[PDB]
């Protein structure tokens, strides 16, 4: 009965991304900024290598329970605060707790589900938690902020975090410190690998595309089409639905089509969709490209996590904390400098030129995935 561990990392990923998206609508209205948004991803980027090394010394359960303790503290602090410095502290602590949760949970999943096919099948479900969290965050925050009050969403999130922590105490039971049997191959050796670098680069560019697309699209919309506020929110919904669908189906479907081919087609499709986005004239023209973008990115992610796990087992020692720290660093890098660089480029040159450059880069990087195919 290892489904409980899958349930733990599903809930930790779900609740963490629920808090990530509930806070974004509330903070600007309550306060009145770029540093605060990027503080979570920057701090999480820095602590990823240290969590990767710490799991090899003491194991996964203590870092996981510690992640819940940091997330619980961050949630209560957000609800009770009202100052900018405390907001920075809380978001930075979430960045630390999210790093712990992501790295330790992914390593524990890779260490519990050792089979190659089952690993991808369960990582699809686990990555579905992120998509569900981003899907249900904003409406949850909106309703509890509308009716009950400002602190109600945070208090309900804290209650769910307490429930999650109690389940963790019952199942994980972080009572003693247990070191891993073998050393894990230091980060310097792994960063010299060209195949790990190719997989990380594909993840980084695919996610950096959407990282720039998401905040830069409403500004172009409100000037080109003069769209209503409700449309600005419901226009990106196809991407979030298609991400869930594609992640959950391609977790199983990528092993038969071939992980390299699924990643290659994902990069090609996301590049073509990003290239066609500037040609749209209204929301109905934007429905299809966003669906394509979400589908392709789900393809890339659900094909590229188990490939990272496979690469460490194929030519290095089977210890997953450091390599999944590398993968998390790849994700955070796109989400840290994404919005600011995107805004700078879209101010220097047009939004269509930014979209064209992103699409061209993705299409040109796409053939690099050919080297990821297995020798036999
Ligand atoms: N790696 C997750 C990429 C992603 C998918 C859907 C989203 O809505 C989003 O903001 C980000």
UniProtKB/Swiss-Prot annotation:
Changing residue 146 to A: Reduces serotonin uptake. Changing residue 243 to A: Reduces binding to dihydrotetrabenazine. Reduces binding to reserpine. Abolishes dopamine uptake. Abolishes serotonin uptake. Belongs to the major facilitator superfamily. Vesicular transporter family. GO terms for molecular function: monoamine transmembrane transporter activity; monoamine:proton antiporter activity; serotonin:sodium:chloride symporter activity. Expressed in neuronal and neuroendocrine tissues. Detected in central and peripheral nervous system in particular in axonal and dendritic processes in dopaminergic cells of substantia nigra, histaminergic neuronal cell bodies of substantia nigra and tuberomammillary nucleus, in ganglion cells of sympathetic glia and in peripheral sympathetic nerve terminals in stomach and duodenum (at protein level). Highly expressed in chromaffin cells of the adrenal medulla and histamine-storing enterochromaffin-like cells of oxyntic mucosa (at protein level). Changing residue 21 to A: Abolishes binding to dihydrotetrabenazine. Abolishes dopamine uptake. The gene is SLC18A2. Serotonin binds at residues 130, 134, 207, 210, 214, 236, 243, 301, 335. Electrogenic antiporter that exchanges one cationic monoamine with two intravesicular protons across the membrane of secretory and synaptic vesicles. Uses the electrochemical proton gradient established by the V-type proton-pump ATPase to accumulate high concentrations of monoamines inside the vesicles prior to their release via exocytosis. Transports a variety of catecholamines such as dopamine, adrenaline and noradrenaline, histamine, and indolamines such as serotonin. Regulates the transvesicular monoaminergic gradient that determines the quantal size. Changing residue 116 to N: Reduces dopamine uptake. The lineage of its organism: Eukaryota, Metazoa, Chordata, Craniata, Vertebrata. It is found in: Cytoplasmic vesicle, Secretory vesicle, Synaptic vesicle membrane; Cytoplasmic vesicle, Secretory vesicle membrane; Cell projection, Axon; Cell projection, Dendrite. Strongly inhibited by reserpine and tetrabenazine. Also inhibited to a lesser extent by ketanserin and fenfluramine. Reserpine and ketanserin inhibit by blocking the substrate-binding pocket. Tetrabenazine traps SLC18A2/VMAT2 in an occluded conformation and its inhibition is specific to SLC18A2/VMAT2 but not SLC18A1/VMAT1. The keyword ATP-binding does not apply. It is a multi-pass membrane protein. Changing residue 123 to A: Reduces dopamine uptake. InterPro entries: MFS, MFS_dom, MFS_trans_sf, MFS_Vesicular_Transporter. It catalyses: serotonin(in) + 2 H(+)(out) = serotonin(out) + 2 H(+)(in); dopamine(in) + 2 H(+)(out) = dopamine(out) + 2 H(+)(in); histamine(in) + 2 H(+)(out) = histamine(out) + 2 H(+)(in). Changing residue 218 to A: Abolishes dopamine uptake. Changing residue 297 to A: Reduces binding to reserpine. Changing residue 320 to S: Binds reserpine in the absence of a proton gradient. Abolishes dopamine uptake. Changing residue 301 to A/N: Abolishes dopamine uptake. It holds the Pfam family MFS_1. Changing residue 305 to A: Reduces binding to reserpine. Reduces dopamine uptake. GO terms for cellular component: axon; centrosome; clathrin-sculpted monoamine transport vesicle membrane; dendrite; dopaminergic synapse; intracellular membrane-bounded organelle; membrane; plasma membrane. PROSITE patterns: MFS. This is Synaptic vesicular amine transporter.
